[PDB]
C-alpha cells in the first residue's frame, strides 16, 4: 500500500588515515539498492538491487558524483561539526544523513523528510511542512540559518514533494517484482521445556517481506502482552526477514494460547496453536 | 535518486 525511498549516509573520521570513512546506502521500502564505501577500490556508487542496475552511466555518474559530493560535503562537515562542537582531531566522529519521501496508496505525495545526525543524535531535520527546520542546538541553528538563508529548505521542498517521489514511483515501477511483492510469513510454533512446570512457546515467522509484521499472543481470545517476548525483525540475508514471538506458559495450558500473525502478505490474520 | 547537485554543507 504505502511506500518510500530513503538514503542513509554515514561518514566517520579517521585521525591518522587519509580521508574519513564514507558509507552511503540507498533504500526503497526495506530493500537496499545502492551503496558507496570510500574504502572500496571502486570509488563509485554501487548497485545492491537488480532493479537499479537498469539505470545507465548518466545515472551512475550522477549518483557517484552526487554521492562523492555528499562524501565531500560530509568530509567538510566532519571538520565543520568537529569545529562547531570543538572536538579533538584525534577523535573518530560520525555524521549520518537520511532523507526520502513517503507515498500513499495512490502514490500521491504523502510526506517527505530530511534528517541529519551527528555522533548518533539528531542534528537538524526538515519539518513536516517542508519549510521549517530543527534547532537541536546552536550548531544546528547555525546550519539552519546557513541553510534557509541559502534557501536550502526550498531545494529539498522541491526534491521531496517532487524529484524523490518521481524517482520513487520510478523505482516502484521498475522494481514491482521485488518492491511490491508480499512474501507471506512462514509461521510455525516450537515447544521448549524451559523447566518442569513451564514451557516456552515460540511463534516463528520466517521469510516474510516487507519486514512490517504484527505477531500477537492471545490467550482465550483475549490479547496478551505479559510473558511474551519478541525479537527485532532480522534479515535472513536474502531479502526476506525473520521474527519470532515467544511466550512463557504453564504446562498443559499451551492450547489455551494462540499466536495472531498479521502481514500484508496474508489477507487473513493467521492464528497458531498447539505445543 | 540522490539529492543534487549536493548539500548544503553543515
Amino acid at each position, epitope marked *: 500500500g504505502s511506500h518510500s525511498m530513503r538514503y542513509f549516509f554515514t561518514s566517520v573520521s579517521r585521525p591518522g588515515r587519509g580521508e574519513p570513512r564514507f558509507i552511503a546506502v540507498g533504500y526503497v521500502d526495506d530493500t537496499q539498492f545502492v551503496r558507496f564505501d570510500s574504502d572500496a577500490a571502486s570509488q563509485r556508487m554501487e548497485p545492491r538491487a537488480p532493479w537499479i542496475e537498469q539505470e545507465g552511466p*548518466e545515472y551512475w*555518474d*550522477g549518483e557517484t*558524483r*552526487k554521492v*562523492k*559530493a555528499h562524501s*565531500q560535503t560530509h*568530509r*567538510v562537515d566532519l571538520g565543520t561539526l568537529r569545529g562547531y562542537y570543538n572536538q579533538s582531531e584525534a577523535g573518530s566522529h560520525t555524521v549520518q544523513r537520511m532523507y526520502g519521501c513517503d507515498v500513499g496508496s495512490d502514490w500521491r505525495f504523502l510526506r517527505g523528510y530530511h534528517q541529519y545526525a551527528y555522533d548518533g543524535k539528531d542534528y537538524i531535520a526538515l519539518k513536516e511542512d517542508l519549510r521549517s527546520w530543527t534547532a537541536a542546538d546552536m550548531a544546528a541553528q547555525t546550519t539552519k540559518h546557513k541553510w534557509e*538563508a*541559502a*534557501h*536550502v529548505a526550498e*531545494q529539498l521542498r*522541491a526534491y521531496l514533494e517532487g*524529484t524523490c517521489v518521481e524517482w520513487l514511483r520510478r523505482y516502484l515501477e521498475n522494481g514491482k517484482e521485488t518492491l511490491q511483492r508480499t512474501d507471506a510469513p512462514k509461521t510455525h510454533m516450537t515447544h521448549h521445556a524451559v523447566s518442569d512446570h513451564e514451557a516456552t512457546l515460540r511463534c516463528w515467522a520466517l521469510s516474510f517481506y516487507p519486514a512490517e509484521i504484527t505477531l500477537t499472543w492471545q490467550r482465550d481470545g483475549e490479547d496478551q502482552t505479559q510473558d511474551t517476548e519478541l525479537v527485532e525483525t532480522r534479515p535472513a540475508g536474502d531479502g526476506t526477514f525473520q521474527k519470532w514471538a515467544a511466550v512463557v506458559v504453564p504446562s498443559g495450558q499451551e492450547q489455551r494460547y494462540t499466536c495472531h500473525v498479521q502481514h500484508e502478505g496474508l489477507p487473513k490474520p493467521l492464528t497458531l496453536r498447539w505445543e | *535518486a540522490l539529492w*543534487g*547537485p*549536493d*548539500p*548544503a*554543507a553543515a
Partner: T-cell receptor
Amino acid sequence: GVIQSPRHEVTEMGQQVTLRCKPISGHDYLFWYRQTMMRGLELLIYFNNNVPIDDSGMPEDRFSAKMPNASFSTLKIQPSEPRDSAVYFCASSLWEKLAKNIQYFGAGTRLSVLE
Amino acid sequence: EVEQDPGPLSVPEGAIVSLNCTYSNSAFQYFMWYRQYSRKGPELLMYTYSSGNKEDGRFTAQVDKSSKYISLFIRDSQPSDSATYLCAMRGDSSYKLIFGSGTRLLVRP
C-alpha cells in the same frame, strides 16, 4: 576577484602551456571554462575542495587540470595544439550562490597557440 | 544540449527584443540568462527555478519546460544591452553549466 594568468599567451605549438587560476578566496567551487571564438562557455572541469567533481568536460589527452591547493588551479596542456586557442575562463563560486546559479568568472586567458 | 540564435540582430533604441533558447534534454531544472561583453566574463541576468514567468525591470525571463523553450524579453532597449546573451541551464546531477553558443545584440542609439 578571480585571477587568471596569463592574460594572454602566444606560444608555438608542441610546447606545454600552463593556464593558472586563483579562485576567489573562500570559494570551494573552481570551474574551468573554455570559450572558443563565437561559441558559448564550455565547462572543462570543476573542483569541490581541490578534488575534480565533474571532469566530463576535459578533452582527455593533453589537458591536465589540477588543484594542488585551494587558492590555485593549474590547467596544463602538453603538446599544446593551435585548436586550444581560446579564452579560458576560470570561474569560482559557493553552494549558496550556486543554488541561484551565480558564478564569478575571471578575465580569462586569451590563449593563442600558433604553428 | 541547447540551441540559440547567434545572429547579431540589430534593434533600434526603445524597441522590445526577444532572446530565446531551446534545449534537447529534460532534467534541466534551472534556466538562466547570461550577458557577455566582447570577451569579458559572463554576467547573469535572469534565473528561473522552473517553468513560469519572471518579471525583472525591462527584462522578462520565461521558461516553458513543456516546449523546452527559455526566453528573455527586453523592453525599451536601452543604450547598453548591446552584447552577447548566453542561456545557461543544468539540474540535479552536477553544477556543470550548459550554455547556448550565444546571441549577439546591438541596440542602436
